[PDB]
Swiss-Prot record:
Changing residue 60 to R: In a colorectal cancer sample; somatic mutation. It is found in: Cell junction; Endoplasmic reticulum; Cell membrane. The modification Phosphotyrosine is found at residues 127, 185, 190. Changing residue 190 to F: Strongly reduced autophosphorylation. Abolishes phosphorylation of downstream signaling proteins. The gene is KDR. The lineage of its organism: Eukaryota, Metazoa, Chordata, Craniata, Vertebrata. It comes from Homo sapiens. The chain holds residues 814 to 1168 of 1356 of the full protein. This is Vascular endothelial growth factor receptor 2. Detected in cornea (at protein level). Widely expressed. ATP binds at residues 27-35, 55.
Amino acid sequence: DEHCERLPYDASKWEFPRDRLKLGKPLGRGAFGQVIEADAFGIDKTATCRTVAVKMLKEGATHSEHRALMSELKILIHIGHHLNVVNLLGACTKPGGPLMVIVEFCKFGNLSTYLRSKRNEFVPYKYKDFLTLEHLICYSFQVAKGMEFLASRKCIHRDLAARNILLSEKNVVKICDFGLARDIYKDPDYVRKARLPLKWMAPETIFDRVYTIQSDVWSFGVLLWEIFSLGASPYPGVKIDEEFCRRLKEGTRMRAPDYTTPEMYQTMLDCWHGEPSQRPTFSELVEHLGNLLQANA
Ligand SMILES: Cc1oc(-c2ccccc2)nc1COc1cccc(CO)c1
């Protein structure tokens, strides 16, 4: 996924005509990119109008950002379809218009915002639309599934967080990446030096700047904390600086979130192990959360 200029674009399969795509109101805006809500006619089903999310650039973007987006398109094609990864539906790449990457619409938006909104409507055990402990383990399991899939397609995420998990209908959650559609300069999550999501980054990524599937496992552990604090921000009160990293470098971890179970907090700790090889794989995380899901019901 770092050598994606060699990956094909099959236009006869993926090209969607711009005149069958009707753009609506923006869902997220960054500095160079945006995600737009749209209506797409017959994109996945014959003569069927479907709501979709369109990822594209905006005023300020250059040829450089255009290449990056074309890369994200090619990677999504390569990766292929999976329930818990935001599915590609088509693209407008023809000259005379902007590069548009057309993906699934996820009604309920990002998982961080959504979980926050459900603090009032939560009960561990079951209330028509109330979240439960089961819902939370289920989300965790789904994301682990999606990440196992991505890992097996020889690529890594690099920005795994609740804000990059979307919630569709019927409790399906999907891994995505807003990328340039997120305003990293005005988002508190991205601390200044490049703007990096330091609270989700593993020590070797902070100090040595090494990105691996195992550093995503670390980030998954932080996502678990977000899920089981119902969308709270990680390391509350604590300010992210040079002396915040040294504490992590010698084993200071977050306390248990308000809604966790003992096993779930232990799973966060496993993910936050110092040695990258000592962290569980996503294959192991899928089996383990599957067990915990069964133990809950
Ligand atoms: C094109 C696109 O649009 C959105 C998106 C669509 C709508 C809203 C927010 C984001 N997510 C993606 C990609 O999601 C990914 C999944 C796995 C791996 C990678 C690459 O590491 C990317």
